[PDB]
UniProtKB/Swiss-Prot annotation, chain A:
9aaTAD, short sequence motif: residues: 249-255
Keyword Zinc-finger among record annotations: yes
Domains: entry comment: The 9aaTAD motif is a transactivation domain present in a large number of yeast and animal transcription factors.
Disease implication from the record: Defects in PPARG can lead to type 2 insulin-resistant diabetes and hyptertension. PPARG mutations may be associated with colon cancer. Obesity: A condition characterized by an increase of body weight beyond the limitation of skeletal and physical requirements, as the result of excessive accumulation of body fat.
Activity regulation, per record: PDPK1 activates its transcriptional activity independently of its kinase activity.
Entry comment on modification after translation: Phosphorylated in basal conditions and dephosphorylated when treated with the ligand. May be dephosphorylated by PPP5C. Ubiquitinated by E3 ubiquitin-protein ligase complex containing FBXO9; leading to proteasomal degradation. Ubiquitinated at Lys-18 by TRIM55 leading to proteasomal degradation. Ubiquitinated by E3 ubiquitin-protein ligase STUB1/CHIP; leading to proteasomal degradation.
Record text on subunit structure and interactions: Interacts with FOXO1 (acetylated form). Heterodimer with other nuclear receptors, such as RXRA. The heterodimer with the retinoic acid receptor RXRA is called adipocyte-specific transcription factor ARF6. Interacts with NCOA6 coactivator, leading to a strong increase in transcription of target genes. Interacts with coactivator PPARBP, leading to a mild increase in transcription of target genes. Interacts with NOCA7 in a ligand-inducible manner. Interacts with NCOA1 and NCOA2 LXXLL motifs. Interacts with ASXL1, ASXL2, DNTTIP2, FAM120B, MAP2K1/MEK1, NR0B2, PDPK1, PRDM16, PRMT2 and TGFB1I1.
GO molecular function: alpha-actinin binding; arachidonate binding; chromatin binding; DNA binding; DNA binding domain binding; DNA-binding transcription activator activity, RNA polymerase II-specific; DNA-binding transcription factor activity; DNA-binding transcription factor activity, RNA polymerase II-specific
Span of domain NR LBD: 4-255
Gene Ontology CC entries for this record: chromatin; cytosol; intracellular membrane-bounded organelle; nucleoplasm; nucleus; receptor complex; RNA polymerase II transcription regulator complex
Native source organism of the sequence: Homo sapiens (Human)
Protein name: Peroxisome proliferator-activated receptor gamma
Tissue: Highest expression in adipose tissue. Lower in skeletal muscle, spleen, heart and liver. Also detectable in placenta, lung and ovary.
Disulfide linkage: none
Full-sequence range covered: 235 to 501 of 505
Length: 255, 259
């Protein structure tokens, strides 16, 4: 009851904090008050360089649009690990069948990645490199044939997701819910997964009603965003199927 | 007040009864063939199919004929849903183009929600319950047509496990129509205001009608995700058919819906 749910919410929030470096509270302040370490801004082809020499980019080893895609892959691999480690703090997650843990992570990370990408996006761009940088939405659409429409649909999703004004303590439970789905293809013991998600869902409801007592039916609106999230992932993989018709060995292995 | 949501629950339920002639209650009573109140005739092959006219109201190869008569039912369901929508409070007050956008995008999502009420894992009622067409028979039909109903069965089997009755669905169907995220809406905010009320009424309803079913509300909303994928598979499958058989006509209403 209240105490029990509110303890898990606290637990998940604490865990969410130390698993994820760039929190939403942090990214929003960096974004459109707390002006003290304003980030470098990539708004066009000329500011993309310099940036390279000014940011501590870790993926540079060749077209501009491909090298931005590849940088987005590197970052995705990092977040998989951060998500993986957060997953392991969700009560009951590690006690599940190991194959099921792997399946849940496998089919969940993309959904979680775009959820949290929203936290770093406004309608004019997205933070990059732990917030030391900013890539404008306009510069991204202007990129080559298949690449210019890779991150527009995430921008579109983010504006409608951020309009819910969740905070991290909201997002922590929300992400738990996503991982502990239960309809992921090929699960062996759905019952403990759904059991856990049921718990997480209960904790999310309470969390939203206390943290947003004036946002009516917010729980239901948040859950409704899962349909947009899955269509986004579904559309994302198809543009990946076209990229395998455009372009390392050991590096191609890492992805 | 709870009491206003309950009255909205009753209103929508009563209008569901009036616009949908084959309820889930009727369908369940037919499907559980332990009630000889009128049992269905069962189509499972070419020969049962051909006998299916001497015995059922039944107005080109086998696959065509089956999906020509499924097109009829589909446009007829569009009208029934369309009639149900006008009964949702506030719906007819919205901008006319919004009204048209809501039906455009909600209608198939509702057709497969309600198709589950006609389905068990084994097959689906047809011709207003008089008939029953097995899942295997549908899955066996020619290269493109056979790939059509199987994803509805898969959804229906899971969705049916929620054990919703007609009063639950009436509210759920109303929430789907009044989304607000549909592409191209002019006044999103009055749509969300109604759906906000619809969602409140659904939540209370599930809590009251299914007291032991924890988080059935949330679980039901998650299902909204399965619906939209099915629309997408179906549509892209529909695009294969118009190129395979250029002699075959999709009904104009359903054409207009698909964009
Ligand atoms: O897209 C639509 O509106 C419908 C949705 C649908 C509606 C009803 C059923 C149904 C199927 C069996 C029994 C009862 C109902 C199945 C699907 O799906 C259709 C699929 C194929 C057709 C079609 C029409 C003419 C020629 C070929 C295919 C029409 C509709």
């Amino acid at each position: 009851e209240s105490a029990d749910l509110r303890a898990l919410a606290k637990h998940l929030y604490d865990s969410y904090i130390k698993s994820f470096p760039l929190t939403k509270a942090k990214a929003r302040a960096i974004l459109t008050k707390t002006t003290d370490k304003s980030p470098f801004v990539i708004y066009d082809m000329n500011s993309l360089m310099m940036g390279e020499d000014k940011i501590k980019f870790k993926h540079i080893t060749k077209e501009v649009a491909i090298r931005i895609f590849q940088g987005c892959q590197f970052r995705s691999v990092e977040a998989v690990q951060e998500i993986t480690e957060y997953a392991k703090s969700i009560p009951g997650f590690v006690n599940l069948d190991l194959n099921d843990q792997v399946t849940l992570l496998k089919y969940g990370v993309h959904e979680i990645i775009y959820t949290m990408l929203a936290s770093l996006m406004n309608k004019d761009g997205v933070l990059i490199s732990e917030g030391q940088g900013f890539m404008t939405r306009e510069f991204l659409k202007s990129l080559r044939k298949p690449f210019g429409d890779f991150m527009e649909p995430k921008f579109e999703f983010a504006v409608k997701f951020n309009a819910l004004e969740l905070d991290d303590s909201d997002l922590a439970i929300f992400i738990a819910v996503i991982i502990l789905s239960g309809d992921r293809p090929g699960l062996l013991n759905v019952k403990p997964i759904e059991d856990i998600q049921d718990n997480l869902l209960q904790a999310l409801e309470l969390q939203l009603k206390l943290n947003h007592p004036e946002s009516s039916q917010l729980f239901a609106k948040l859950l409704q965003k899962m349909t947009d999230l899955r269509q986004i992932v579904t559309e994302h993989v198809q543009l990946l199927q076209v990229i395998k018709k455009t372009e390392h060995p050991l590096l191609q292995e890492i992805y």
